[PDB]
Amino acid sequence: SNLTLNFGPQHPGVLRLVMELSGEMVRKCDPHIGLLHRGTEKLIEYKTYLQALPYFDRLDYVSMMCNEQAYSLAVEKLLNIQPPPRAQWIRVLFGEITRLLNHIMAVTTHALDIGAMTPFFWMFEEREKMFEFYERVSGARMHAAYVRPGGVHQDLPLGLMDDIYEFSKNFSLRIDELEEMLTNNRIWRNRTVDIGVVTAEDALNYGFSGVMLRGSGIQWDLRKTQPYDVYDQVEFDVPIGSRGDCYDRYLCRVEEMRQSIRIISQCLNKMPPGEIKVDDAKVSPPKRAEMKTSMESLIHHFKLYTEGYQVPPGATYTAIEAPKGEFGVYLVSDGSSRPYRCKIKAPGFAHLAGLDKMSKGHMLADVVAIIGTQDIVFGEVDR
Amino acid sequence: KKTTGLVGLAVCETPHERLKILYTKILDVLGHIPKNAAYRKYTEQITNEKLSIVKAEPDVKKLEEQLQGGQIEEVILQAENELSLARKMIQWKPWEPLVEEPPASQWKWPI
Amino acid sequence: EDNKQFFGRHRWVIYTTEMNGKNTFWDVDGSMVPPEWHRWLHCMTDDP
Amino acid sequence: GVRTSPTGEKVTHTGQVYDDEDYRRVRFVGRQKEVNENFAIDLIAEQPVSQVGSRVISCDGGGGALGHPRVYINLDKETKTGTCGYCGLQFRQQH
Amino acid sequence: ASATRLIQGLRNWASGRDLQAKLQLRYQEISKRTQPPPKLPVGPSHRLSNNYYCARDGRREAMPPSIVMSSQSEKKAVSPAPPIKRWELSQDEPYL
Amino acid sequence: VKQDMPPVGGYGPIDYKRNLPRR
Amino acid sequence: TRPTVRPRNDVAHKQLSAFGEYVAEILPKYVQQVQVSCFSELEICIHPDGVIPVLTFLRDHSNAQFKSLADLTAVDIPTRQNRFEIVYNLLSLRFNSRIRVKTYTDELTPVESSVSVYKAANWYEREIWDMFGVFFANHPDLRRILTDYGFEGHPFRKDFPLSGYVELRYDDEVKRVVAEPVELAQEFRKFDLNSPWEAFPAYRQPPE
Amino acid sequence: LHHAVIPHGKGGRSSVSGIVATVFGATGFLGRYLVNHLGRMGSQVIVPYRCEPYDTMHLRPMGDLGQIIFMDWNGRDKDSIRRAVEHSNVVINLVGREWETKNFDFEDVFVKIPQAIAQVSKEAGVEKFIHISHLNADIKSSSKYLRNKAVGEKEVRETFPEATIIKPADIFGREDRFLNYFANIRSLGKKTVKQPVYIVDVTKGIINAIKDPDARGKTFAFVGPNRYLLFDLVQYVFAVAHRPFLWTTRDKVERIHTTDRTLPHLPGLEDLGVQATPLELKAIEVLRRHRTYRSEIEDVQPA
Amino acid sequence: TSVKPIFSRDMNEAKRRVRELYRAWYREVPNTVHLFQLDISVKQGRDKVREMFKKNAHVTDPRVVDLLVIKGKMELEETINVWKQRTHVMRFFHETEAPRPKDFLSKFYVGHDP
Amino acid sequence: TQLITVDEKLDITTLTGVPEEHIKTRKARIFVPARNNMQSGVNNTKKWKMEFDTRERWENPLMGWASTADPLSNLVLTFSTKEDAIAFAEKNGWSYDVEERKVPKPKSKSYGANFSWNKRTRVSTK
Amino acid sequence: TYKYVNLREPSMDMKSVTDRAAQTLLWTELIRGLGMTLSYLFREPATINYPFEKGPLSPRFRGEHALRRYPSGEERCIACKLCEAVCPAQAITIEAEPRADGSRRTTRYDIDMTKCIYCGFCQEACPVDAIVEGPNFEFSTETHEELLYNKEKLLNNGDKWEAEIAANIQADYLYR
Ligand SMILES: NC(=O)C1=CN([C@@H]2O[C@H](COP(=O)(O)OP(=O)(O)OC[C@H]3O[C@@H](n4cnc5c(N)ncnc54)[C@H](OP(=O)(O)O)[C@@H]3O)[C@@H](O)[C@H]2O)C=CC1
Ligand code: SF4
Ligand code: SF4
Ligand SMILES: [Zn+2]
């Protein structure tokens, strides 16, 4: 009949793929995913808000602050709290840093998943400096919680923005050298141009989000249409793709890195010295000096860490432009100290839904290039 | 103009008469809809207003930026989709009264 | 502590033999440094 | 500094030493019972009983935001010195 | 830095960026650790004789969701929002 | 006083353009 | 009320009120609750006989585009007869709006399976079948996504416990991985955190 | 008995059963399956090993978190053995190599090893010492192996009188010695009755004997339900191994040509109460590795 | 209580679909026991298949029998494909229970177990 | 459509996957939780909690924890009326004991009778 | 504001088409990529020697938490169970008893390092700063038994250094 290959969990991420292929050029591929299933939604249902914030930190794991930002803005949207301006600007700066990190890992792991070895090492030296910044800010290497609902917790120490300025200059030169290395590299252009075309009608019906909508025509940015924070005050532009190519989508990711450099530059130049957290002791914990020499601050610290703050009853769905796309969180909260049911819209899940139309008329090396060309981490796809 | 931005949307060549025959078909199939429903009123209102915008345009870009709906062929796809739901809503009779109610102690949230 | 090389090669340690009678000329571990030099050597300060 | 049962194994600051009829004596074979040899009771009985000339006095813990929250304790009994619950160190009055 | 001239020239010639000035090894503009200790300001709270919590009671302002329609010669047919404007090309080099 | 981290009068420019020599 | 309180807008609130009233006027057959919350997102609460008519109306009709589909879930609520709530979460492209079509169902009812009018709902519907237990009729493929093959019990319910009934371990008798009943090493201490004193008076249900 | 020796709840995986077993040997075949069934019981298994920690690493993840414990021993010092059975509920003796070495022989392994451990376990004060021995171990000749095991049975009956001497037949299993030794060959044709018995029935018998008293003192014998001829056994194992084909010491070949006999003067499996299984199911289990790709159940069953 | 069905109208189509599914499970076993290289004869596998069909014998509601037919058909498709491994098909059996008895007396010697 | 016409109980117990041991062995206590008597607040009322019986929690012999052979023990199902509680308990299969809801008695207290003339309601300490 | 790319036509001017043909035939840009790889060949390596140069860190690094104690005094903990209440992995196990002096204290303070996600919530939830996430990364444990810290491994680990922990807290007690 036809060859029903079973690509197991070995490395060409981690999945299982059963492809009923015709003859080096396929027929019917089915991704069996769910191998990395953990039980995040049931665990958040049996825990509180502040305690189950790290589940939202690590359900996606390459992006590490946009997922925190999405859950914290879900809770701050439901709880009716505007965060202070310096918290909003630090949240914007770290959103752009995490965006730069996720796009550069997607570029390098797509290059290594094809087989090119060296810009992986170059840009991972750059991402080692990124993790040095995360270490100095929070204390963690990767999984900095750091974003409480109620603003940024424990603001950045003195002597950081100069290092971010130096990193901005050197990283602009390094991404220019990446475009020098690849990108009009002839064999790589031969590797990926005409594979995985996506009609914009199918991009809307199959529910593609983020970079796929940029590549397949239609102009759609959450940062431009629905400013959920101080993005309306920083000036940037989004790149759009003419043809539905993979090469086009690569160019779009590189130019989103470059626009992240612009937003980091303006955010450094326009920092207000407002405050760390909100002006409400019943949501954010009070600082430790007032805790020690104050009665009400000790009472609010004690109850706010045992019971937690309550949330008024209601349901909300917010979604922010994570580097993979519209990362969505839908909270349903009975009026209590625990959420009733949370659910996560994953752009990687929505992109992996259309794998049939992205790999109908191509070969299997192009199937590996299609799996690589969408920033799919297989921990977020699981929910 | 040539090669608009959307990928699987190849360009049109005659916008005016194609969109006019689309909306005459809209008004025909909507003429087969019963009268006392609100749906006939709202659809016939918005389609006559949109066609009356279309009736007096010599240009292309002026019609694109003046008539909302944005890009010129997405309007045509939108019109084809509205004709498809008009054919579907000849069936399904949605203007009839409500189907059987829930147990009414249900849509209250806080449990 | 050298000053001319880049950030990462500022401060190095040279271990000696016979600190607990373990023959530590070869197979040198981490963890043999006392904690004040553990503050100094991970670049958390500027003073020895 | 520490007591030791006649089974040969060290007690802790909590008296949890095993009996003759256990098997955790066998789980300690070859590997030492890493007991803290620094008890917490006897490092307070060596402290000087402080004598402060007021009546109701404060206790911080030696440093702003380095120590327990403030407790104000009363020193009106004549035979029992007041005792901070956080600190553990006593006070007296002088008049 | 601190390399000789010949390999510096071959680095500059094999990639024409004048690579010496920006090379990503950080030497002197590492931020000087053990900074002076900070005093952190307090924002729009703590002002005495206005901080009634009934004013900024952001939790209790959350009203229950309003409803209508249920189970128990007219210019109309509204949209959920005004229609979205077509964007314009930015000026910072539109065709990269 | 206050001891936050603002920039010192505004930082310099950071380039954001694709640089190629086309040699 | 100006610092640290989220400022609400009334223009979007009035527009979503008018649009929800308009939707319930033009579809009288299937509409029961039309609610706008305080932060202006529309919710339409729906009988399970009109999933295909409401979504074919809402993907088209040219006055509400709503091309994109997001979260689908059917939040597992006890205390009712009809337990599950299926939440289609529709996002437009031409309009910047968000509506939630919330239809209800119990444990043993086929809803009309929106895979034909939203191709994104394929794995969403298959996932809700595997995790909750709501069968979807006239649907191409229902398999088990995100669960083990030998595992069953529909685990995201409130009735399925936190730890499962089976637990895997390797053994050398049969030289493979086997399933055994769960013998936890620690209790999973459940905390009684829901304190009294009624933190919200605006959400008091009327007593009996 | 002190507390934490009473049982608690169900079986296995941090379900505290009530025995603490010091298991000698335990690195090879039968000891590994017995540690498997004790970790399934949920006990504390003290295994002493004299070898590399890599083999006890391969048998390591059997028990639960810290249930099994590892310690070193030797065949020369009584102090390490008394340290091994300081506090133990039960102790089982499973030791013996099927070929000689330069440091330990067939002589005095079965005389010097069980005397020393039985002496120090009587003096340490434990109960329910279970010693395995081979069947047909007699003072009669034709095996240094079998005469040494007969002297061992007599000595462990003499000292420590309340011992459980138990004896299986030529046990077969997934990683067997003699059946795998039959499959790995190239042979002769004679007649000899021989009854294999499967290893999980034997170790179920051992755990029932180790937790089910009224069986202390009495010696037991394991009899498989088959009791048939060797020649048809070899032809059946070749026919199930899909090959026609029509350390190898002299003591091993004389063991597989020793006619195994049974006496009903000591009770078998039914007075202990566990079901025995026939050959063919587990034979089709173990006989893998046929050919590249490659039923005819013989079932001779003589007498 | 005019309830929407799944597939059927009463128990007649329920019995027809379950005997169709049992015919499929009967002709589906020997292929799998040759394929996945199990250790159990065909007759024991067929006996435990008919035991799994005799387990749910007191079910009367037609929607429930329809949903059990759907469950069995899904698992038969996943076993006629080579998606499920040797582990799950052996997990259908019970070889590693050391099964707890059902007499009151042996439940009394290992107690606190009603 | 609406083809099925039947008035019978539901039998989800063969579909919910929990085995027969935990079906016919345990029991569900259905109760309003008592007011936490050290506090004074009846917000912890108004929710019919369904809970199960507790079982053995022995000691983990390496640390001193509370190991358990109990999946279903850490559940609680908060309901709003007794009828839906009984309906869910009879539907999903297991046994049930429905306890009673005991309201506080409406008393009549009066400061003026705390300061009476001839009666024995003379507090003599305020 | 959109800035779209991939829009050029092949210029039928002779110079553009002969430059694209020269690119296709004479292998220009592949040798240009070789030039970039040679430019990184002649650099200095950005590696650090591990067993002699441990890498840089931050004064708020989280890992290997241990219990502090008072300056010239007893244990700092109270067994107030705030850290057990906030521990998101539910790794903390506290059993409290008072001693003969009358101050409230403990008996059992057990942490699973295996379960510990290393947040910092037990660092920040403690009112008297008893448990503090330490400086280092020295676990590398051969057995699963040994990664379950009792109170006395925690107190030996808080007595193996306080000078480090007191220096980090005195560096960073004005932020938190
Ligand atoms: N055919 C069979 O398999 C039958 C076997 N038996 C009995 O079963 C027992 C185990 O046999 P089996 O597993 O097949 O073979 P093994 O030889 O592999 O098992 C014996 C165990 O004791 C250890 N051991 C042997 N001699 C010494 C020694 N001098 N010093 C220290 N350790 C020693 C072995 O190696 P290590 O030192 O590395 O731990 C191993 O752990 C034997 O006592 C045998 O009499 C009984 C009936 C049938
Ligand atoms: S929070 Fe601090 S004082 Fe309280 S129990 Fe934990 S370590 Fe002890
Ligand atoms: S850092 Fe570890 S011990 Fe502390 S709260 Fe987090 S999981 Fe618990
Ligand atoms: Zn004090």
PDB file of C-alpha atoms in Angstrom, chain B:
ATOM      1  CA  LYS B   1      -2.506  47.658  -9.323  1.00  0.00           C
ATOM      2  CA  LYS B   2      -1.115  44.123  -9.257  1.00  0.00           C
ATOM      3  CA  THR B   3      -0.273  41.406  -6.666  1.00  0.00           C
ATOM      4  CA  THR B   4      -2.061  42.496  -3.507  1.00  0.00           C
ATOM      5  CA  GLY B   5      -0.762  41.365  -0.141  1.00  0.00           C
ATOM      6  CA  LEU B   6      -2.808  38.242   0.572  1.00  0.00           C
ATOM      7  CA  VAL B   7      -1.301  34.984  -0.625  1.00  0.00           C
ATOM      8  CA  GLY B   8      -4.088  32.788  -1.967  1.00  0.00           C
ATOM      9  CA  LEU B   9      -6.152  35.792  -3.055  1.00  0.00           C
ATOM     10  CA  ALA B  10      -5.287  36.445  -6.686  1.00  0.00           C
ATOM     11  CA  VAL B  11      -6.264  39.902  -7.921  1.00  0.00           C
ATOM     12  CA  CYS B  12      -9.570  40.922  -9.475  1.00  0.00           C
ATOM     13  CA  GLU B  13     -10.048  42.679 -12.806  1.00  0.00           C
ATOM     14  CA  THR B  14     -13.566  44.211 -12.746  1.00  0.00           C
ATOM     15  CA  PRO B  15     -14.553  45.257  -9.209  1.00  0.00           C
ATOM     16  CA  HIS B  16     -17.623  47.356  -9.974  1.00  0.00           C
ATOM     17  CA  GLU B  17     -19.878  45.086 -12.029  1.00  0.00           C
ATOM     18  CA  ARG B  18     -18.870  41.944 -10.102  1.00  0.00           C
ATOM     19  CA  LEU B  19     -19.753  43.556  -6.789  1.00  0.00           C
ATOM     20  CA  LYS B  20     -23.007  44.891  -8.277  1.00  0.00           C
ATOM     21  CA  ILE B  21     -24.132  41.476  -9.493  1.00  0.00           C
ATOM     22  CA  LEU B  22     -23.152  40.056  -6.085  1.00  0.00           C
ATOM     23  CA  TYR B  23     -25.448  42.519  -4.362  1.00  0.00           C
ATOM     24  CA  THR B  24     -28.323  42.026  -6.812  1.00  0.00           C
ATOM     25  CA  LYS B  25     -28.105  38.328  -5.948  1.00  0.00           C
ATOM     26  CA  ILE B  26     -28.065  39.307  -2.250  1.00  0.00           C
ATOM     27  CA  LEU B  27     -31.248  41.362  -2.629  1.00  0.00           C
ATOM     28  CA  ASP B  28     -32.884  38.547  -4.630  1.00  0.00           C
ATOM     29  CA  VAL B  29     -32.218  35.753  -2.108  1.00  0.00           C
ATOM     30  CA  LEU B  30     -33.127  38.180   0.672  1.00  0.00           C
ATOM     31  CA  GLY B  31     -36.323  38.908  -1.242  1.00  0.00           C
ATOM     32  CA  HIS B  32     -37.185  35.255  -0.734  1.00  0.00           C
ATOM     33  CA  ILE B  33     -36.930  35.777   3.076  1.00  0.00           C
ATOM     34  CA  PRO B  34     -40.135  36.370   5.119  1.00  0.00           C
ATOM     35  CA  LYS B  35     -40.958  39.945   6.034  1.00  0.00           C
ATOM     36  CA  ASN B  36     -41.818  40.307   9.723  1.00  0.00           C
ATOM     37  CA  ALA B  37     -38.453  38.919  10.844  1.00  0.00           C
ATOM     38  CA  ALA B  38     -35.938  41.528  11.933  1.00  0.00           C
ATOM     39  CA  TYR B  39     -33.189  39.801   9.923  1.00  0.00           C
ATOM     40  CA  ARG B  40     -34.658  40.884   6.572  1.00  0.00           C
ATOM     41  CA  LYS B  41     -34.852  44.474   7.831  1.00  0.00           C
ATOM     42  CA  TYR B  42     -31.269  44.707   9.095  1.00  0.00           C
ATOM     43  CA  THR B  43     -29.718  42.873   6.130  1.00  0.00           C
ATOM     44  CA  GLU B  44     -31.716  44.843   3.553  1.00  0.00           C
ATOM     45  CA  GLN B  45     -30.827  48.100   5.328  1.00  0.00           C
ATOM     46  CA  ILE B  46     -27.079  47.474   5.437  1.00  0.00           C
ATOM     47  CA  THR B  47     -26.968  46.010   1.924  1.00  0.00           C
ATOM     48  CA  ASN B  48     -28.908  48.886   0.354  1.00  0.00           C
ATOM     49  CA  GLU B  49     -26.640  51.368   2.143  1.00  0.00           C
ATOM     50  CA  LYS B  50     -23.534  49.528   0.952  1.00  0.00           C
ATOM     51  CA  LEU B  51     -24.787  49.189  -2.631  1.00  0.00           C
ATOM     52  CA  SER B  52     -25.813  52.862  -2.668  1.00  0.00           C
ATOM     53  CA  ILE B  53     -22.250  53.686  -1.660  1.00  0.00           C
ATOM     54  CA  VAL B  54     -21.087  51.509  -4.570  1.00  0.00           C
ATOM     55  CA  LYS B  55     -23.453  53.059  -7.181  1.00  0.00           C
ATOM     56  CA  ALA B  56     -21.603  56.372  -7.636  1.00  0.00           C
ATOM     57  CA  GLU B  57     -17.861  55.629  -7.658  1.00  0.00           C
ATOM     58  CA  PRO B  58     -15.633  56.128 -10.729  1.00  0.00           C
ATOM     59  CA  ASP B  59     -12.411  55.113  -9.006  1.00  0.00           C
ATOM     60  CA  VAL B  60     -10.987  52.129  -7.133  1.00  0.00           C
ATOM     61  CA  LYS B  61      -8.929  53.515  -4.239  1.00  0.00           C
ATOM     62  CA  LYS B  62     -11.693  55.985  -3.364  1.00  0.00           C
ATOM     63  CA  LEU B  63     -14.125  53.071  -3.096  1.00  0.00           C
ATOM     64  CA  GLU B  64     -11.601  51.095  -1.030  1.00  0.00           C
ATOM     65  CA  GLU B  65     -10.947  53.861   1.489  1.00  0.00           C
ATOM     66  CA  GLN B  66     -14.501  55.268   1.463  1.00  0.00           C
ATOM     67  CA  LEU B  67     -16.560  52.089   1.736  1.00  0.00           C
ATOM     68  CA  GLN B  68     -15.508  50.256   4.869  1.00  0.00           C
ATOM     69  CA  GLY B  69     -14.414  46.674   4.582  1.00  0.00           C
ATOM     70  CA  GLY B  70     -10.910  47.766   3.635  1.00  0.00           C
ATOM     71  CA  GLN B  71      -9.258  45.773   0.868  1.00  0.00           C
ATOM     72  CA  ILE B  72     -11.304  45.435  -2.284  1.00  0.00           C
ATOM     73  CA  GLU B  73     -11.480  41.661  -2.795  1.00  0.00           C
ATOM     74  CA  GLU B  74     -12.044  40.801   0.866  1.00  0.00           C
ATOM     75  CA  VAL B  75     -15.300  42.719   0.349  1.00  0.00           C
ATOM     76  CA  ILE B  76     -16.100  40.282  -2.474  1.00  0.00           C
ATOM     77  CA  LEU B  77     -15.304  37.238  -0.310  1.00  0.00           C
ATOM     78  CA  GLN B  78     -17.396  38.794   2.477  1.00  0.00           C
ATOM     79  CA  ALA B  79     -20.283  39.194   0.019  1.00  0.00           C
ATOM     80  CA  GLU B  80     -19.980  35.563  -1.094  1.00  0.00           C
ATOM     81  CA  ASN B  81     -20.033  34.452   2.552  1.00  0.00           C
ATOM     82  CA  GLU B  82     -23.123  36.549   3.237  1.00  0.00           C
ATOM     83  CA  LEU B  83     -24.825  34.971   0.223  1.00  0.00           C
ATOM     84  CA  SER B  84     -23.902  31.560   1.636  1.00  0.00           C
ATOM     85  CA  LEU B  85     -25.537  32.324   4.974  1.00  0.00           C
ATOM     86  CA  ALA B  86     -28.562  33.775   3.165  1.00  0.00           C
ATOM     87  CA  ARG B  87     -28.982  30.432   1.389  1.00  0.00           C
ATOM     88  CA  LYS B  88     -28.500  28.657   4.717  1.00  0.00           C
ATOM     89  CA  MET B  89     -30.969  30.921   6.565  1.00  0.00           C
ATOM     90  CA  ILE B  90     -33.677  30.236   4.039  1.00  0.00           C
ATOM     91  CA  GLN B  91     -33.520  27.003   6.037  1.00  0.00           C
ATOM     92  CA  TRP B  92     -33.165  26.656   9.853  1.00  0.00           C
ATOM     93  CA  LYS B  93     -36.038  29.187  10.475  1.00  0.00           C
ATOM     94  CA  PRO B  94     -34.320  31.303  13.184  1.00  0.00           C
ATOM     95  CA  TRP B  95     -37.088  33.922  13.473  1.00  0.00           C
ATOM     96  CA  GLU B  96     -39.391  31.412  15.176  1.00  0.00           C
ATOM     97  CA  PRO B  97     -39.823  31.757  18.983  1.00  0.00           C
ATOM     98  CA  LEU B  98     -37.485  30.305  21.582  1.00  0.00           C
ATOM     99  CA  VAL B  99     -36.665  26.612  21.823  1.00  0.00           C
ATOM    100  CA  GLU B 100     -37.272  24.977  25.203  1.00  0.00           C
ATOM    101  CA  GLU B 101     -35.894  26.863  28.198  1.00  0.00           C
ATOM    102  CA  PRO B 102     -33.168  25.691  30.628  1.00  0.00           C
ATOM    103  CA  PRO B 103     -34.046  24.760  34.247  1.00  0.00           C
ATOM    104  CA  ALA B 104     -33.527  28.520  34.994  1.00  0.00           C
ATOM    105  CA  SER B 105     -31.395  27.978  38.115  1.00  0.00           C
ATOM    106  CA  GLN B 106     -28.414  27.567  35.831  1.00  0.00           C
ATOM    107  CA  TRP B 107     -26.981  30.767  34.410  1.00  0.00           C
ATOM    108  CA  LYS B 108     -26.389  32.298  37.840  1.00  0.00           C
ATOM    109  CA  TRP B 109     -22.686  32.043  38.409  1.00  0.00           C
ATOM    110  CA  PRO B 110     -21.319  32.229  41.965  1.00  0.00           C
ATOM    111  CA  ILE B 111     -22.648  28.740  43.034  1.00  0.00           C
TER     112      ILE B 111
END
